[PDB]
Amino acid sequence: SQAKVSVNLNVKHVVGGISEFDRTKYITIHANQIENEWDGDNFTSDLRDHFLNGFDVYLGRDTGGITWNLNNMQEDASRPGFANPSNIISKGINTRNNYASKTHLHVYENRKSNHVVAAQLHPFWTGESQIATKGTGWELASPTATGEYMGRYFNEFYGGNGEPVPSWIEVINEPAYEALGGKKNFTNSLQEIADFHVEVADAIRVQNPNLKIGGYTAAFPDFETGDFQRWINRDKLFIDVAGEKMDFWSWHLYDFPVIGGKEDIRSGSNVEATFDMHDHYSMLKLGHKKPYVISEYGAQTHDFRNEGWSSYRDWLFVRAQNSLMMSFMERPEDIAMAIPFTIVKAEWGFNTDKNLPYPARLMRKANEPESYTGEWVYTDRVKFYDLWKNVKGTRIDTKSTDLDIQVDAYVDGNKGYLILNNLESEETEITLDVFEKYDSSITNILKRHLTLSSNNVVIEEETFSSSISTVQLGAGSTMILEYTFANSLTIDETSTEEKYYADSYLQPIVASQPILFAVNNVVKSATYGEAVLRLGLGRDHGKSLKPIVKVNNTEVVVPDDWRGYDQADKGRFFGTIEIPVSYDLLTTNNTVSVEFPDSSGHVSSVIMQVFNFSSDIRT
């Protein structure tokens, strides 16, 4: 594979007003610094420091606190099925006081800006699978009782002298996964879960109206399944039923690189189509977008579930998290918080029947996999953080000739961070076209290559004293070039990205029948720019993904090589084809014509991604 990556160090890339890397939202871990797992017999005396400070990692998410407390909360004697308010209060005092006493944890509040808390499914869920509180043995009366508890919980177990209230409250973790029949089900309705969210959110807001509340924390947002029936029955329905009650959308986005020997990957076009369709419908139905909390993402490793830790298994996660995070970094204004699902130790997740530890761990005992003994040492998932430890600064315009090379770049004064992320399993020779208007010289490039070498995660580093023109980006690998310039870079050009949504979505594809889309009110706020027509395509394998596309009745070239892999092992293709559209083809109200040679499937979403350049930066 070969790709040319253009890097315009003076062009700030703005979207939704955001043009700074937000490590508090992106470089995160599914932890809370209060968790005992940060302590213990660790390879270092201060794991919190070594990890959170050492790699400048942010927080975070936890569910056990609210779940344990509900599981052990006394019942309201006057209102069966409700948590007793005075016991929520009383227990909250002890929690806040305990927190206040953990003085050495208080510094890490400045890393908890996007604290996410989700209720676990039980005993919060009031549906058919509802169980009584594990400790006190009573069943939540209603979603209202659940929301009231949660509302009281967040009022009493946070604030005051205790832990600051979390910033993102997910109503309930992965409510549909089991109850609605799993990832391939598309017939079951999310109606009850949606009503659950509305009712819980109403009750939370009653107790605390200043909590951002989200749902439905989908385990697997798979919109295309069953001719998009799954989308209709679940995620569309959630927007329809709960949209006006949610402050944010919550998703878990997991690549499945090794599920029954299949490679079912969200990274690339699929996750893009997922955001695209959900955004598009949200625009059509609600008239606005909501931020996403990706409270779990990365990879799961099903074919390894009967195996312990391995570096390669960490790789599968590390590769997924990179490729997925790059997509989240393209949409900073839509991302409230994205947390790779990496638990510090997940001792609570140890599988005693299998004598295997939880798969998703920052730490492992040194003697693993051979023995669950020895001090806690890092898994190779730390290499992700190691690689990203320095990324900060102003996002600048980057571009790849190959959509499988996801590029981003951030300039922090005289430090430049160029991220090259390989969606594909091919090594790619990247030609670097780094343009800088003001001659500012490179004093140093630290080339940090996070890749798979001998089935282990490694960061291969080379250092350079002058510009480099080509790098080898490994298969599925991520490279950060940490540039140092003689002087702070002047970022006086601007690429303002605005996204525009067709007046229609989810359009059935009929052979030789053009699907006509209006993409209207496109502000061409500059003289120079470029646009990306984003066609969400949901089609069976074997159906064409190269429609004839016209923008304002001018035919535009549809790439044969879309962002990401082929999706062969996925149930079907669901992915956004990113179609270069020239700025001069764009007008205010645009028609998009999409015509396939074959029937079936749908143009799930149509988004015109418009980039408005302060100057002719492409030429």
- What is the SS3 assignment for 77-121? CCCCCCECHHHHHHHHHHHHHHHHHCHHHHHHHHHCCCCEEECCC
Nearer to Ca ion, 156 or 578 (CB): 578
Query: Of the residues 156, 170, 174, 497, which is catalytic?
Result: 174
- In the set 148, 404, 497, 498, which binds Ca ion (CB under 5 A)? 404
The stretch among 34-42, 347-355, 401-409, 608-616 that binds Ca ion (CB under 5 A) is 401-409
Shortest distance (Å) from residue 579 CB to Ca ion: 14
Beta strands in 175-265 (DSSP E): 212-218, 248-259, 262-264
**Catalytic annotation present for 296:** yes
Q: What are phi and psi of 420, to 5 degrees?
A: -115, 120
Query: What minimum distance in Å lies between the beta carbon of 117 and Ca ion?
Result: 33
Nearer to Ca ion, 49 or 561 (CB): 561
Q: State how far the alpha carbon of 55 is from the alpha carbons of 152, 383, 386, 392, 602, in Å.
A: 35, 10, 6, 12, 43
The tokens describing 495, both together, are 């690429």
Question: Shortest Cβ contact with Ca ion: which residue?
Answer: 404
Cβ 19 to Ca ion shortest distance, Å = 12
Q: Contact, 434 vs 7, CB < 8 A? A: yes
Element (H, E) at 148: helix 143-156
Question: C-alpha dihedral over 76, 77, 80, 81, to 10 degrees?
Answer: 30
Pairing of strands 478-485, 442-453: antiparallel
Minimum distance, C-beta of residue 410 to Ca ion, in the bound complex (Å): 12
> Where are any strands of DSSP class E within 491-547?
493-501, 507-508, 515-519, 528-539
Q: Which helix (H) or strand (E) holds 323?
A: helix 311-329
Residue with tokens 């990247």: 430
Q: How far apart are CA 469 and CA 172, in angstroms?
A: 49
- Cβ(221)–Cβ(278) under 8 Å? yes
Q: Is 136 helix (H, G, I), strand (E, B) or coil?
A: coil
Catalytic residue among 37, 75, 156, 296: 296
Would you say 398 or 604 has its CB closer to Ca ion? 398
Within 379-398, which residues bind Ca ion (CB under 5 A)?
398
Taking contact as CB under 5 A, which single stretch among the options 29-37, 334-342, 467-475, 555-563 is the one that binds Ca ion?
555-563
CB of 315 to Ca ion, least distance (A): 20
Residue 215 or 564: which CB sits closer to Ca ion?
A: 564
Contacts of 53 (CB under 8 A, 6+ apart): none
Residue in this structure with the two tokens 């016991």, named with its chain if needed: 87
Least gap, CB of 536 to Ca ion (angstroms): 16
Tell me whether residue 398 or residue 590 sits nearer to Ca ion (CB atom).
Answer: 398
Binding of Ca ion by 561 (CB under 5 A): yes
- Name residue, tokens 């944010």: 248
Residue 402 binding Ca ion, by CB under 5 A: yes
Nearer to Ca ion, 76 or 404 (CB): 404
Minimum distance between the CB of residue 400 and Ca ion, rounded to whole angstroms?
7
**Smallest separation (angstroms) from Ca ion to the CB of 505:** 24
Told to judge if 174 belongs to the known catalytic residues of this protein, a careful annotator would answer yes
Q: How far apart are CA 603 and CA 294, in angstroms?
A: 25
Binding site for Ca ion (CB under 5 A): 398-399, 402, 404, 561
Catalytic residues: 174, 296
